[PDB]
Amino acid sequence: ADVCMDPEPIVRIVGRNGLCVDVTGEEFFDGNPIQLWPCKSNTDWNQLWTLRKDSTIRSNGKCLTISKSSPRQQVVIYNCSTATVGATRWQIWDNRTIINPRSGLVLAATSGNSGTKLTVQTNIYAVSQGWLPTNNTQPFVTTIVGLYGMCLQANSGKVWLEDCTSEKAEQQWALYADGSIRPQQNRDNCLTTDANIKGTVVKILSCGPASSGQRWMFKNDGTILNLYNGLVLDVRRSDPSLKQIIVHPFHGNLNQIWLPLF
Amino acid sequence: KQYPIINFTTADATVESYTNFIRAVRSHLTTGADVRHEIPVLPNRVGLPISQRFILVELSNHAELSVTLALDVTNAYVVGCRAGNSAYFFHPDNQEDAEAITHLFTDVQNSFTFAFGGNYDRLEQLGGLRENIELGTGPLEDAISALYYYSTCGTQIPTLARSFMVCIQMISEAARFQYIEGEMRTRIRYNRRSAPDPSVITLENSWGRLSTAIQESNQGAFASPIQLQRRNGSKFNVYDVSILIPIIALMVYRCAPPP
Ligand SMILES: OC[C@H]1O[C@@H](O)[C@H](O)[C@@H](O)[C@H]1O
Ligand SMILES: OC[C@H]1O[C@@H](O)[C@H](O)[C@@H](O)[C@H]1O
Ligand SMILES: OC[C@H]1O[C@@H](O)[C@H](O)[C@@H](O)[C@H]1O
Ligand SMILES: OC[C@H]1O[C@@H](O)[C@H](O)[C@@H](O)[C@H]1O
Ligand SMILES: OC[C@H]1O[C@@H](O)[C@H](O)[C@@H](O)[C@H]1O
Ligand SMILES: OC[C@H]1O[C@@H](O)[C@H](O)[C@@H](O)[C@H]1O
C-alpha cells in the first residue's frame, strides 16, 4: 500500500460573510488576535495559511492558536513551539468545520463584521463556525436544480421550486464558504430553516444570525443537509405546485435530490 | 464464473428507472467500501482478482434489443460490449488489461477486439466531438440498436464510436459524477436529447485529475487548483473538495490512505 501525500497547501480561509482569516494589522507577535478581514487579492502573508502535515495552520511560521488569555476562547497567532502544542493543532472538516481537537471547540466568528476577532466555540454547526480552505474567495454562484429538473427560486423571504429560465436572477444562488446558501438578488439573506423539526418549511431570512439553520452541507448523495438538525432539503409532497421546500428526514427520493448546476 | 449484471431499458424509462440504474451501477463498483472525503473510491486495479474485475450492464430498448457493455470496476469505463452472439472489445492500453478483457464474453465465438482503444481521444477521431454527440433516452435507444447490429453490417464504425460514447457518458460518466447523472435525468425527464455542455465534458476530462487532487489533499485542501468550466464555457478554479462532494461520486484509486 503506497501511501498518499500531504501537500501542505497554502490557502486563504474564508468564513462568515466570506471574509478571510486575517492576522490583525500584520503584527506577528505571540498573542496578536486573528480576525475576519475582507479577502486580499495580493500575496500578503497575514491572509495565507499553510496546512502543514502536523495539523497546524501556520501563517509565516506562526500558528493559528487558542489564547489562554483571561476570558479565553480567543484565537490568536502564536510561536508554534512556544505555544501549548494542543492549541495549535486543528482539523479542517469536509463539513466546513475547523476544529481544535484538544478542546473540541471550533473556530468561530461571532460577527459578520470585518475586524471581528476569531474565537473558538462549541460546535453547533452554525454559519459563524463554517470555513473553507480555498484561494477562491468568491461565492460559488450557481443554480440549484431539484425535482423535475426544476430550479430553486427565491422571491422575498419565500423560496419554492420553479421551471429553470436562463435569465431569472431569482434562480441564482451564491454558495458561501461559510456553508450558507444565499440568493444572488440579496446576499444579505439566507436559505433558512427557523426550526429543527420535520415539515419545517424553509425560508429566505436575514443571515445576521449565522445560525445553524442557515448553514448547509451538500452531501455526496445529492441531498442538501443541515448538519445541526440532520434533516435535508425536501420538496414537500414531491409536489413543486405546493411552492414549499421543507426539511425532512433523509430518504433519498428525487424530491430530496439536488444538483448545483453551474 | 459470471460477473454481476445491472439492468436498464430505454423502453418507457423514467428519471427513477435511470436513477436506480446508476445507483445500482455505483453500488456494484463500490462494494469495496473505501470512501474519502465522502466520495467513494473504486477498487484498486493493482492486485484486483480477475473474478471481481468487471460488472455487466444489460441494456434493452423499445425495439426489444439487448447489448451488454462490460465495465472495468477499476474506472467504471466500458471496455467492451456484447451484441447478442457477437462481442467486441476496445484495444487495451496495456498487456495487463488486454489479458483481463479476455475473461469477458468467452462463450461468444465472434468475439474480437478492435485496433482502436475506447478513450475519447480515439472515439472522437472515429466518430466526432463529444460536444456534437447528442445525449438522452433517444440516442441511447439508437446507440443500443447500432451496437446490436454492428456484427450484421448495420453499423458504421464512426457510428459504433458514437454509439459507444453516448453509453459511456450516459452510464460510466454518470456513475462517476452525480452531476452528469443529474444532467441525464433532466434530459430523460423531458425527452429532450442534447449534447454535453462544457461543464460535462470538462468533468469527464478531469475525472483523473480530480480523483488525484482529492486523494492527495491535506484536509480537503488541494496542493494545486483543478480547473473546471460552467455550462457557459467560462473556467474556474477549485482549491477545495467541499465544492465537489456533490459533483463527483466515484474516484479511481490513486494511493493508499495513510494509516
Ligand atoms: O508559492 C506561493 C503561492 O502558493 C500558493 O499555494 C498560494 O495559493 C499562492 O497565493 C502563492 O502564495
Ligand atoms: O487594520 C487591520 C488590517 O491592517 C492591514 O494592514 C492588514 O493588511 C489587513 O489584513 C488587516 O489586518
Ligand atoms: O520564531 C521566533 C521564536 O522562535 C522560538 O523558537 C523561540 O523560542 C522564541 O523565543 C522566538 O525567538
Ligand atoms: O526564528 C528565529 C528564532 O528561532 C528560535 O528557534 C530561537 O530559539 C530563537 O532565539 C530565534 O532565533
Ligand atoms: O468522527 C466522526 C466525525 O467525523 C467528522 O469527519 C465529521 O465531519 C463529523 O460530523 C463526525 O461524523
Ligand atoms: O443477482 C442479481 C442479478 O440477477 C439477474 O437475474 C438480474 O437480471 C439482474 O439485474 C441482477 O438483479
Residue B249 contacts residue B40 (beta carbons within 8 Å): yes
Please give the Cα distance from A71 to A189 (Å, whole number). 32
- Point out the ligand nearest to the CA of residue A62: 3
Please give the Cα distance from A132 to A15 (Å, whole number). 7
Q: Please identify which residue in the block is written with the cell numbers 479511481.
A: B252
Check residue A70 and give left, alpha or beta (phi > 0: left; psi -120 to 50: alpha): left
**Other CB atoms within 10 A of residue A28 CB:** 17
Distances (CA, A) of B167 to A186, B58, B93, B170, B191: 42, 11, 20, 5, 17
Residues A95 and A189 in one domain: no
Q: Please identify which residue in the block is written with the cell numbers 419554492.
A: A160
Give the three-state DSSP class for A197: coil
Please give the Cα distance from B89 to B79 (Å, whole number). 6
Closest partner CB to A254 (pick from B15, B178, B183): B15
Please give the Cα distance from A163 to A198 (Å, whole number). 26
Distances (CA, A) of B149 to A51, A221, B61, B155: 56, 37, 13, 6
Select from A99, A179, A91, A100 the least CA-distant residue to A132: A179
Residues A108 and A187 in one domain: no
Q: Cα torsion for A61, A64, A66, A70, to the nearest 10°?
A: 70
Give the three-state DSSP class for A229: coil
Domain boundaries, chain B: 1-175, 176-259
**Other CB atoms within 10 A of residue A191 CB:** 27
Helices B15-29 and B178-189, packing angle to 10 deg = 160
Please give the Cα distance from A67 to A79 (Å, whole number). 12
- One-letter amino acid identity for A67? S
Q: Domain boundary at A104, A138, A172, which? A: A138
Residue A137 contacts residue A189 (beta carbons within 8 Å): no
> Chain A partners of B179 at a C-beta cutoff of 8 Å?
259, 261
Beta-sheet pairing, B110-113 with B86-89 = parallel
Is the Cα torsion angle A74, A77, A83, A85 positive or negative in sign?
positive
Superfamily in which the B176-259 domain is placed by CATH? Ricin (A Subunit), domain 2 (4.10.470.10)
Is the Cα torsion angle A37, A43, A45, A49 positive or negative in sign?
positive
> Chain B partners of A148 at a C-beta cutoff of 8 Å?
189
Select from A152, A154, A172, A147 the least CA-distant residue to A162: A152
Helices H / strands E in chain A, number of each: 0, 22
Residue A70's Cβ-count burial label (10 Å; 0-12, 13-18, 19+) is exposed
Residues A95 and A175 in one domain: no
Interior angle at CA B222, CA B212 and CA A225, nearest 5:
95
Please give the Cα distance from B165 to A49 (Å, whole number). 43
Protein residue closest via CA to atom 3 of ligand 6:
B5
A1, three cell numbers: 500500500
Q: Is A3's CB within 8 Å of B256's CB?
A: yes
Phi first, then psi: what are they for B88, rounded to 5°?
-125, 150
Residue A146 contacts residue A153 (beta carbons within 8 Å): no
CATH code at B1-175: 3.40.420.10
Residue A129 contacts residue A116 (beta carbons within 8 Å): no
Residues A117 and A210 in one domain: no
B239 a catalytic residue:
no
Protein residue closest via CA to atom 2 of ligand 1:
A10
Phi first, then psi: what are they for B180, rounded to 5°?
-80, -40
Give the three-state DSSP class for B32: coil
Q: Please identify which residue in the block is written with the cell numbers 425535482.
A: A147
- Point out the ligand nearest to the CA of residue A80: 3
Give the three-state DSSP class for A227: coil
Residues A3 and A67 in one domain: yes
Distances (CA, A) of A41 to A24, A47, A81, B188, B249: 17, 10, 30, 43, 32
Give the three-state DSSP class for B208: helix
Interior angle at CA B29, CA A250 and CA B58, nearest 5:
100
Residue A206 contacts residue A180 (beta carbons within 8 Å): no
Residues A143 and A207 in one domain: yes
Give the three-state DSSP class for B61: coil
Phi first, then psi: what are they for B245, rounded to 5°?
-45, -45
Resolution (A): 2.6
Select from A67, A71, A56 the least CA-distant residue to A29: A67
Q: What is the CATH number of the domain that holds A228?
A: 2.80.10.50
| Alpha helices (runs of H) in chain B, residue ranges in sequence order | 15-29, 95-100, 120-127, 137-149, 157-167, 174-176, 178-189, 198-215
Name the DSSP letter for residue A222: S
> Chain B partners of A238 at a C-beta cutoff of 8 Å?
none
Transcribe A20-84 into DSSP letters.
EEEEGGG--STTPBEEEEE--SS--GGG-EE--TTSB-BBTTEEEEEE--TT--EEEEEETTTS-
Name the DSSP letter for residue A118: P
B65, three cell numbers: 434489443
Please give the Cα distance from B195 to B166 (Å, whole number). 10
Beta-sheet pairing, B66-72 with B54-60 = antiparallel
Name the DSSP letter for residue A212: T
Number of domains composing chain A: 2
Give the three-state DSSP class for B62: coil
Atom of ligand 1 nearest to the CA of A9: 6
Q: Domain boundary at A87, A114, A138, which? A: A138
Query: Which residue is closest to A95 within chain B, CA to CA?
Result: B242
**Residue A95, ligand 5, Cβ within 6 A:** yes
Please give the Cα distance from B173 to B163 (Å, whole number). 15
Please give the Cα distance from A12 to A115 (Å, whole number). 16
Closest partner CB to B239 (pick from A136, A220, A259): A136
Residue A13 contacts residue A34 (beta carbons within 8 Å): no
- One-letter amino acid identity for B170? M
The count of residues in chain A is 262
Select from A132, A241, A143, A124 the least CA-distant residue to A183: A143
Please give the Cα distance from A190 to A208 (Å, whole number). 9
Residues A198 and A219 in one domain: yes
Q: Residue B96 contacts by C-beta under 8 Å, 6 or more apart in sequence?
A: none
Residue A229 contacts residue A124 (beta carbons within 8 Å): no
Name the DSSP letter for residue A113: S
**One-letter-per-residue 3-state SS of A124-159:** CCCHHHECECCCCCCCEEEEEECHHHCEEEEECCEE
Give the three-state DSSP class for B2: coil
Distances (CA, A) of B77 to A135, B119, B231: 33, 9, 24
Residues A82 and A164 in one domain: no
Protein residue closest via CA to atom 3 of ligand 3:
A79
Select from A4, A42, A5, A52 the least CA-distant residue to A22: A42
Q: Cα torsion for B203, B207, B212, B214, to the nearest 10°?
A: 50
Q: Please identify which residue in the block is written with the cell numbers 425560508.
A: A203
Inter-chain contacts counted by CB atoms under 8 A, chains A and B: 121
Q: Cα torsion for B175, B178, B184, B185, to the nearest 10°?
A: 120
How close, in Å, is residue A219 to chain B by CA atoms? Answer: 6
The coordinates were experimentally obtained by: X-ray
Residue A11 contacts residue A20 (beta carbons within 8 Å): no
Please give the Cα distance from A26 to A45 (Å, whole number). 8
Distances (CA, A) of B148 to A36, B61, B84, B195: 61, 11, 7, 23
Residue B66 parent element (H or E): strand B66-72
- A222 touching B (Cβ < 8 Å): yes
Residue B67 contacts residue B144 (beta carbons within 8 Å): yes
Could you give the maximum distance between any two Cα atoms of chain B, in Å? 54
Residues A52 and A169 in one domain: no
From B3, B18, B26, B77, active-site residue: B77
Q: Domain boundary at A138, A168, A190, which? A: A138
Please give the Cα distance from A219 to B247 (Å, whole number). 9
Q: Is A149's CB within 8 Å of B238's CB?
A: no
Residue A107 contacts residue A91 (beta carbons within 8 Å): no
Is the Cα torsion angle B158, B160, B161, B165 positive or negative in sign?
positive
* Residue span of the structural domain in which A118 resides: 1-138
Distances (CA, A) of A68 to A55, A77, A103, B104, B126: 19, 12, 12, 65, 67
Is the Cα torsion angle A130, B251, A142, A258 positive or negative in sign?
negative
Distances (CA, A) of B178 to A153, A258, B185: 22, 10, 10
Buried b (16+ CB within 10 A) or exposed e, B114-126: beebbebebbbeb
